[PDB]
Amino acid sequence: MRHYEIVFMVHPDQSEQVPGMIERYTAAITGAEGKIHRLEDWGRRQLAYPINKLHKAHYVLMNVEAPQEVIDELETTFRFNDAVIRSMVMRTKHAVTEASPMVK
Template identity: 70%
Template sequence: MRHYEIVFMVHPDQSEQVPGMIERYSNTIQKDGGSVHRLEDWGRRQLAYPINKIHKAHYVLMNVEASNDAMEELTTTFRYNDAVIRNLVIRRDEAVTDESFIMKAEKESRERKTRYEERQAADKAREESSAEEKTEEAAAE
């Protein structure tokens, strides 16, 4: 069994069918004794250039260990599935299980956004409490 990294892009109108496609492709790999080491659904993203007048696509990354027969079947499935716009299959030397750079960047972006929102809420609460203190001081005088 060899290790592979697979990235495929799905037509944006077919985005709701992506989980079913992932399940089918995973079953194809696993029925010959292979395994999926990493599966990342990157979601809809802007394409670098239009493909068949399409500007967005749904991206999926899979790192798998599979037999040659399973990979031939998978590439044939990609070729004849109209929903798959592009695919890339790369043979790897070893299994990759850690997060991809894209997922790490998205996670950091989400964390930064939540920290920013928390800071904004804290600042707003501080401003409201200082405004209340000023009104209390003015009422006491």
């Protein structure tokens, strides 16, 4: 429908919970016949500045071709979920399946 690109940052103490969260997110996307073109756990990462007093955080990239309702839902979930510190759902023109420059 519309090709979004999502990057969310999880609190580093909840790093072991991340995979489950990712799975959940994927599931929702799948539900509305939404494809998920790339998905990249960047892992624990040093922040350029300390958001909410903490210096590292766990970054997950995820590209999705989904309807906007589901995106909205995801956003809502993120906002209420306290594990995820920041998110940045961000539209894109194409599917962009090729890997990110920091993974490579």
